[PDB]
Amino acid sequence: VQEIDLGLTCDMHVHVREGAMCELVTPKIRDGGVSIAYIMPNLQPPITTLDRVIEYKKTLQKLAPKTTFLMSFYLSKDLTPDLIHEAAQQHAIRGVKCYPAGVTTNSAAGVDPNDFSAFYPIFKAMQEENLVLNLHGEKPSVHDGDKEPIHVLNAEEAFLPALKKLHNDFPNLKIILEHCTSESAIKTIEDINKNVKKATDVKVAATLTAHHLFLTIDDWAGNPVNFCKPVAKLPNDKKALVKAAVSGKPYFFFGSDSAPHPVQNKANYEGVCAGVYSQSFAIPYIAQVFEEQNALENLKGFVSDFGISFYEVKDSEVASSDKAILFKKEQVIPQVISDGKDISIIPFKAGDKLSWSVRWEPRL
Amino acid sequence: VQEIDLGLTCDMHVHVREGAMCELVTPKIRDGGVSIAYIMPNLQPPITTLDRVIEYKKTLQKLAPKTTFLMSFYLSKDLTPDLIHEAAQQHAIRGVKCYPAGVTTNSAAGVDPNDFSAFYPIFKAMQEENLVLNLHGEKPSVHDGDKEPIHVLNAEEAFLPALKKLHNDFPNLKIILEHCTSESAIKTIEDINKNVKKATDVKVAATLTAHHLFLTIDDWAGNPVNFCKPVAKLPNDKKALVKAAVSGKPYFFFGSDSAPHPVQNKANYEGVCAGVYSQSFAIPYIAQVFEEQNALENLKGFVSDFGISFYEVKDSEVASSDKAILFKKEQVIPQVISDGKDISIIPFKAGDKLSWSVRWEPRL
Numbered sequence: 245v246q247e248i249d250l251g252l253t254c255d256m257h258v259h260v261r262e263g264a265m266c267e268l269v270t271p272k273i274r275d276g277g278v279s280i281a282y283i284m285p286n287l288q289p290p291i292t293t294l295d296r297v298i299e300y301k302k303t304l305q306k307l308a309p310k311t312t313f314l315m316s317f318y319l320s321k322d323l324t325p326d327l328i329h330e331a332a333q334q335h336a337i338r339g340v341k342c343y344p345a346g347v348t349t350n351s352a353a354g355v356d357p358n359d360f361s362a363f364y365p366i367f368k369a370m371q372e373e374n375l376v377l378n379l380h381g382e383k384p385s386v387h388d389g390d391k392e393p394i395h396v397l398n399a400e401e402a403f404l405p406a407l408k409k410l411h412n413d414f415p416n417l418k419i420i421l422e423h424c425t426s427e428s429a430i431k432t433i434e435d436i437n438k439n440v441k442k443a444t445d446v447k448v449a450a451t452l453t454a455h456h457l458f459l460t461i462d463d464w465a466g467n468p469v470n471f472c473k474p475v476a477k478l479p480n481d482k483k484a485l486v487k488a489a490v491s492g493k494p495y496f497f498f499g500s501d502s503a504p505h506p507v508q509n510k511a512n513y514e515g516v517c518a519g520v521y522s523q524s525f526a527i528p529y530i531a532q533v534f535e536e537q538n539a540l541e542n543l544k545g546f547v548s549d550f551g552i553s554f555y556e557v558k559d560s561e562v563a564s565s566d567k568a569i570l571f572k573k574e575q576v577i578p579q580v581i582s583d584g585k586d587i588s589i590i591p592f593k594a595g596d597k598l599s600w601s602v603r604w605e606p607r608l
Numbered sequence: 609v610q611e612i613d614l615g616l617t618c619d620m621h622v623h624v625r626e627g628a629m630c631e632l633v634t635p636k637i638r639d640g641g642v643s644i645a646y647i648m649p650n651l652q653p654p655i656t657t658l659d660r661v662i663e664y665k666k667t668l669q670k671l672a673p674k675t676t677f678l679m680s681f682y683l684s685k686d687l688t689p690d691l692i693h694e695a696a697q698q699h700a701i702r703g704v705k706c707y708p709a710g711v712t713t714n715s716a717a718g719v720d721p722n723d724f725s726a727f728y729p730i731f732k733a734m735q736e737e738n739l740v741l742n743l744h745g746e747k748p749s750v751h752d753g754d755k756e757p758i759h760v761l762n763a764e765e766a767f768l769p770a771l772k773k774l775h776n777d778f779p780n781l782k783i784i785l786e787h788c789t790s791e792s793a794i795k796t797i798e799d800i801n802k803n804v805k806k807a808t809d810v811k812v813a814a815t816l817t818a819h820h821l822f823l824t825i826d827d828w829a830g831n832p833v834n835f836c837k838p839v840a841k842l843p844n845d846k847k848a849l850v851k852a853a854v855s856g857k858p859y860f861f862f863g864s865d866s867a868p869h870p871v872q873n874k875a876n877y878e879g880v881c882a883g884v885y886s887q888s889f890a891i892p893y894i895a896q897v898f899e900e901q902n903a904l905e906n907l908k909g910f911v912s913d914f915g916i917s918f919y920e921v922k923d924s925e926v927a928s929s930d931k932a933i934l935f936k937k938e939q940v941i942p943q944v945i946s947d948g949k950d951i952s953i954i955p956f957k958a959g960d961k962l963s964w965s966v967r968w969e970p971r972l
């Protein structure tokens with residue numbers, strides 16, 4: 245039936261860029277049906293200072309006063325444990341995001357996941373302040389020599405050893421394997437969460453995107469719009485992701501990884517920018533998956549409950565207690581999301597119709 | 609500098625699309641070091657009539673008088689055995705290309721490979737006229753059904769059972785698995801030619817493109833200029849294709865599948881036209897692979913000998929007795945290949961350096 249009450253929705257993986265790109269995307273978080281959003285720091289330059297993350301959050305609140313913003317740091321060589329403690333006590337960050345060097349957009353200044361020992365003092369400081377270590381799990385491509393070949397199709401599976409070693413050396417740290425794309429990564433998350441029927445005892449979780457529940461490799465093969473990192477893998481991998489989405493287990497919640505790019509950055513014959521834009525219809529995208537799986541009863545937990553529980557979002561931080569109501573009204577997705585200016589976006593599943601819509605109903 | 613006499617080179621897979629594109633790419637066949645070229649019929653509309661294939665060859669000979677052309681028919685429901693016999697008796701065609709519906713460029717008016725029985729009257733007529741059945745070995749992608757899901761990475765391996773049935777039903781018909789990409793296809797070709805000596809005995813062979821000896825999945829991921837059908841697969845597959853190329857076996861000869869597209873057709877955000885342009889440096893591309901393998905003694909067979917032996921190219925049909933001579937002269941690939949008016953093509957490995965160049969020397 246229609247009009248499902250979702251409460252305070254969560255999108256723990258968001259890119260609202262900057263500039264006129266920010267003026268267009270930040271309001272769409274509200275229009276997409278999301279109240280709490282976790283902002284990613286891969287900007288130019290990456291957000292690695294206290295003044296940058298504070299003024300960046302202020303600019304975001306001016307553009308969307310009703311949206312709760314959870315800020316983050318870019319795991320870079322410039323980060324010090326002193327900066328981690330100072331920013332965490334001032335409530336400026338909720339975690340630090342890690343980018344492997346060169347695997348995705350604005351990841352050039354990232355880290356090498358084969359020598360994580362350099363950032364162990366950083367993770368030690370994060371564990372004390374109860375921050376979250378967001379991981380873009382993918383090994384950089386290696387075609388060189390005798391070592392096993394690492395390519396875009398198995399770079400996620402080759403990273404799982406690094407995830408299990410980080411969970412071993414920092415057991416109390418909250419780690420998130422962002423935007424899982426392979427079945428091998430799903431089984432590892434279930435193995436780490438072996439015997440936790442305790443919703444609050446989940447320390448290593450995994451976010452799932454909207455496009456990775458639809459796309460396979462065939463969808464982005466000749467279509468750069470569906471190209472993102474990690475790449476959309478085989479249908480067997482999509483089968484494991486969709487089952488893990490409607491799973492209802494507390495270690496799986498929603499992170500969109502909505503990466504807006506100008507359409508000129510996607511119509512390239514080489515060097516196409518990675519990332520799918522799904523912010524304008526974030527909740528209706530996930531609504532179609534849970535409807536086709538006949539598991540709409542687990543939609544609130546995946547979108548709202550498990551995200552708030554893991555990040556420990558207390559009610560004193562929510563900028564607007566308005567609730568997101570998902571009512572079954574057909575709407576067609578526009579061919580292009582534009583701002584009446586040089587900026588234009590091709591949204592995910594542009595042209596198709598979604599069975600659900602989203603509106604806002606405040607609490608009384 | 610070092611020189612290599614290659615004789616009458618062969619490129620048994622060439623796309624020479626109509627229009628101003630034809631007048632631009634057809635001379636590049638001779639400039640690429642290719643003397644004999646097998647022309648593919650995937651035009652718009654495809655080449656299914658006797659009048660259209662006669663006029664097309666005369667257009668090609670008008671643009672490249674010194675290049676020998678071997679024409680082909682497009683496997684379609686419009687074909688009849690009476691048309692097969694008449695065309696083969698006039699030396700109008702040399703074989704028929706099979707395009708599975710919805711697999712590659714201009715495949716739409718194609719066939720369904722898990723139902724090949726409807727074209728057995730055509731194969732029966734081709735078997736009597738000693739024609740060659742060129743196969744695009746890729747089952748159409750099916751992600752649903754109670755059967756194994758088919759995608760761009762296993763569509764070639766899923767076609768192998770169809771190739772084994774055609775070689776069984778028509779044992780004396782010549783069949784070529786065009787542009788092998790997977791290792792499973794390499795092992796399938798070697799096993800069909802188990803008890804095969806004295807190359808004349810080869811009935812089922814395979815062509816290996818120039819770009820598949822360089823590219824993997826990481827090369828076309830985010831680079832539509834390297835996107836082609838079949839998809840460049842994992843490094844394990846690339847290793848087998850290179851081993852099979854320099855092996856010197858008679859059932860592996862060179863077919864480039866040079867698929868020229870305007871740069872405005874590769875720079876799309878949806879529906880990117882597949883195909884790599886490797887015509888302008890066809891032979892120098894292959895020479896780079898054989899130099900890296902120290903198997904230059906087997907180069908003359910892979911590009912000249914095994915192609916003539918399989919297609920039975922008599923000396924009375926060769927349009928020019930000039931020999932393609934490789935000489936070790938370093939050259940840079942241009943950034944674009946343009947006719948100067950409306951068409952600009954991004955060539956394969958544009959910007960890199962090749963250690964060989966091609967010149968033509970008269971015979972005797």
Ligand SMILES: Nc1c[nH]c(=O)[nH]c1=O
Pocket residue numbers: 259286348349350380472473501503504517518519520
């Ligand atoms: N464009 C992007 C793609 N993928 C990411 O993970 N982040 C981005 O910003």
Ligand SMILES: Nc1c[nH]c(=O)[nH]c1=O
Pocket residue numbers: 623650712713714836837838865867881882883884
């Ligand atoms: N563009 C093409 C790609 N692959 C083919 O086999 N033919 C084409 O024309």
Ligand SMILES: [Zn+2]
Pocket residue numbers: 348380422423473474501
């Ligand atoms: Zn990412």
Ligand SMILES: [Zn+2]
Pocket residue numbers: 257258259284501502503
């Ligand atoms: Zn992201």
Ligand SMILES: [Zn+2]
Pocket residue numbers: 712744786787837838865
């Ligand atoms: Zn093909």
Ligand SMILES: [Zn+2]
Pocket residue numbers: 621623648865
């Ligand atoms: Zn072709």
